[PDB]
């Protein structure tokens, strides 16, 4: 195992390391190291981009380093951790209020890629095979970049996973909202690479959102789980057993969910996986992130030059700047004389994209 | 140790097993199996009745097989778990919205029973000591069923506890409000039978209300612990000890509120119990749960033919329904011209049960 | 070790302890100990002052016994426990809703000191640099004193530690807002009164609040830890390190920002500490305590006589005690005829300090 974290001088030599990768979830890895440098300064590693691999060259994560440590120090070595998560895990740090006008999903989890993260084309792709409808009017409301983005794939059952370029040396973001978004087909063994521990657990447009819903509690139906050695298992993957005292579904195919991971110096890697069935009435869909509860009113004031800017509807346009909260050009939302006057804006049941006029003020 | 499934034909071989039972909740027993056939499927198991026995014939819990796993495989057995629950921990399988109209909570609890889950008087008996009210209006809103039948019963101090009917074979709730629902009386030991392991932690209509509040925080201002090998022993019961190097309180007589519970075949039964002393001048009282918070505002449209359904108050009868998420004729509410017309409900400091009209669309 | 609990005939001799210090909130000390009485009662000991000392007479914590724990008992003796917490963990016990008129963030925490709590100038003191202009008016809704008062100096970034007043033998609260409360100045060792086990962790009026926030991220951007023997190590003090193995942060000096401590008979005093570096330009802030959500309307009456109390911005007076869940005094709310009339307030952005009529019942 080899950890490159770009621009540093002081040797890196692995000594434990633990790794999460999940699907619709920017991956971590816990990576602890020995070096003969006692002083590695944070401002060498933090912000500065990692690639973590498994040597046979297997298997690489590209990413940036998000947390440094300086663990303990002996005579000659200093230990040390990192943590290495995906580009896309930065966007836990940009929280602005923005309404987004007329767009997609796919088309607004985009903008919010390339506008405030310079995410580019190579860095992430869209392998859609359902259509999505533009929305008028979608909020952001006190919300993080990523659990907005994640909220709207999850809310209409687009997933993603991770994948390397070869070339770039980069991770990409993948999206599918289908079963040929999966990759086939490894075959394992039980139990050189391997499969064995083997356990399962079973518990109890639209229209479209029904389906979306349905399949989703299908997810949370059937949890099957395993350990392996094999270096190449990811989420994402449909594998399938040998076996054959393996259970039934194992040898049908599996879809990887999950993967928890790790290895040291005398251990070496092993990983224990989750993962739902192959079936061709359902599909791979994340947990639904719950909506942002709109509870009190938003000050708005009314545009116009100066009468009112009011469409065919009525459905006064309003903004809501006052505090830099607000995204430039996405201040303002179309909303049901006067008009630069301030009024209050409500919610019906709590919902951001439900919003009304209560309220003059 | 036995487990009964009915409709099995694989045998079942208790391995090892983890209980709880606690009072005002459904208990919830964890047991693990082995069996000759490997491959039991979770259909010939997932809504299932199951048996649950300590062997003398001493106790049985009753309930529905709510969980199950396939653990591993060996040359010649496999090993399983399965998750034993009461009927009454499917309503939390239902959450749909509903207006009770003139009302008592009992009456509503037996209702949610009857209706939703075929629960049919042999499965359910109330032995209230106190007389409760009829309520005008009382709203279920994004609550399951447990979750709001038990803040019903918890606002007003109603408890529960499971109890076995020997010739039907089947779990029955017996509601109670008082201490003549405590069903007495043990006399251990100390340490065939025992307690042992005695330890104690103290901390720092109406009306009525004031008067549950008061019992409730008497209620977590004493908690009493111990541990058991007692297969009688159980919430519900009111137990003394033999002693005398046992603490005054455990000689006075304690009312189990909670066990855990445990054996396997190389270790059998043990439990911890929760208890709270015997006391004249109070009663078990269970925690409150919190009521759903009511942000932003319901529409709903004003009903008759055709003016207004008006009632010597006005008070106009409102209608919620749009979305079946509300149950058959539990979605119209009497609130505080024109009248066919769309209003907007909102809730004085977020209580569900003080609507009013805001609000006109 | 010794703990001296006031009027306890009953000998205490100290078995195990773990105790919790850390700035801005209250200790908490979970101590062990057994007696020669087998059935020492809660009412000698529950709400009784506390003594613990570190024996050479090194530190005490002066407080209150907040739990009482029977443990077990044998032939000839009984184990026990008690929490130690200073008086201002009580604050936790009282939570009435109030208003609070024309006051600074200090004036406001010294009344619910003073008023509720009956502390007196000894127990409690400000050495604040900045200056804290006086609010119009600043509510106190659904949260505890402690809730509260801790809130209020978090958002505003003073915070505090505690000190022992050796002649009157109490514990006293002391405020600051930068860098000069810090105390000077210890330096260890490495490793009589030691320091070891280094580490660090990075990741990635006004005005003012955005100094506040800035530094608030400064705080949680560098976790500076460590282990130690030194019986004067606490929270509140600035130490440095001799080393020189240690890292260069420990050497500049670092601010102690919590404590987690223990012993036992057969193991004796070791400290973990968590720290800060020392810096000119940011010091110590505590964690911001969201504020509550205010969703749903609050009665109020309009008061005067009798034509309506309203002064020059109307702006009306008025009340909101209806239910003694107001503080004397503290119940009327400045709030933009008829006037004994019936209105709903309702809170801009769910901010309890941002109210608004809505609002006529």
Same mark, same amino acid.
């Given at each position: 195992?080899?950890?490159?974290?770009?621009?540093?001088?002081?040797?890196?030599?692995?000594?434990?390391?633990?790794? =999460?990768?999940?699907?619709?979830?920017?991956?971590?890895?816990?990576?602890?190291?020995? #070096?003969? @440098?006692? *002083?590695?300064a944070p401002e060498s590693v933090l912000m500065q981009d990692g690639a973590f691999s498994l040597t046979a060259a297997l =298997?690489?994560?590209?990413?940036?380093?998000?947390?440094?440590?300086?663990?303990?120090? #002996?005579? @000659?070595? *200093?230990?040390?951790?990192?943590?290495l998560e995906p580009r896309m895990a930065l966007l836990t740090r940009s929280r602005q209020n923005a309404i987004y006008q007329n767009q997609t999903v796919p088309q607004i989890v985009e903008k919010i890629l390339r506008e405030r993260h310079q995410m580019r084309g190579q860095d992430f792709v869209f392998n859609l095979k359902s259509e999505y409808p533009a929305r008028e009017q979608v909020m952001q409301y006190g919300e993080d970049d990523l659990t907005f983005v994640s909220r709207l794939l999850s809310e209409v059952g687009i997933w993603f996973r991770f994948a390397t370029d070869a070339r770039l040396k980069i991770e990409v973001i993948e999206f599918y909202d289908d079963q040929s978004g999966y990759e086939r087909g490894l075959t394992l063994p039980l139990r050189t690479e391997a499969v064995w521990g083997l356990?399962?657990?079973?518990?109890?447009?639209?229209?479209?959102?029904?389906?979306?819903?349905?399949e989703r509690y299908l997810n949370e139906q059937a949890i099957l789980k395993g350990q392996s050695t094999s270096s190449l298992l990811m989420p994402g993957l449909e594998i399938k057993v040998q076996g054959d005292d393996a259970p039934a579904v194992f040898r049908k195919?599996?879809?990887?969910?999950?993967?928890?991971?790790?290895?040291?110096?005398?251990?070496?890697?092993?990983?224990?996986?989750?993962?739902?069935?192959?079936?061709e009435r359902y599909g791979y869909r994340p947990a639904l992130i719950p909506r942002p509860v709109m509870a009190g009113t938003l000050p708005a004031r009314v545009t116009s030059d100066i009468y009112a800017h009011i469409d065919k509807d009525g459905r006064y346009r309003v903004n809501l700047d006052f505090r830099d909260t607000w995204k430039p050009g996405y201040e303002s939302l179309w909303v049901r004389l006067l008009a630069g006057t301030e009024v209050s804006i409500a919610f019906e049941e709590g919902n951001p994209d439900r919003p009304y006029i209560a309220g003059v003020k």
């Open positions: 195992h080899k950890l490159k974290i770009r621009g540093l001088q002081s040797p890196v030599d692995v000594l434990t390391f633990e790794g =999460r990768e999940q699907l619709s979830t920017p991956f971590r890895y816990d990576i602890q190291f020995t #070096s003969s @440098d006692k *002083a590695i =298997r690489t994560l590209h990413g940036v380093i998000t947390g440094f440590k300086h663990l303990s120090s #002996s005579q @000659d070595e *200093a230990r040390y951790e990192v943590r356990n399962t657990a079973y518990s109890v447009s639209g229209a479209f959102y029904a389906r979306i819903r349905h195919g599996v879809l990887i969910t999950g993967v928890t991971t790790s290895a040291a110096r005398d251990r070496s890697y092993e990983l224990t996986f989750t993962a739902i069935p192959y079936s």
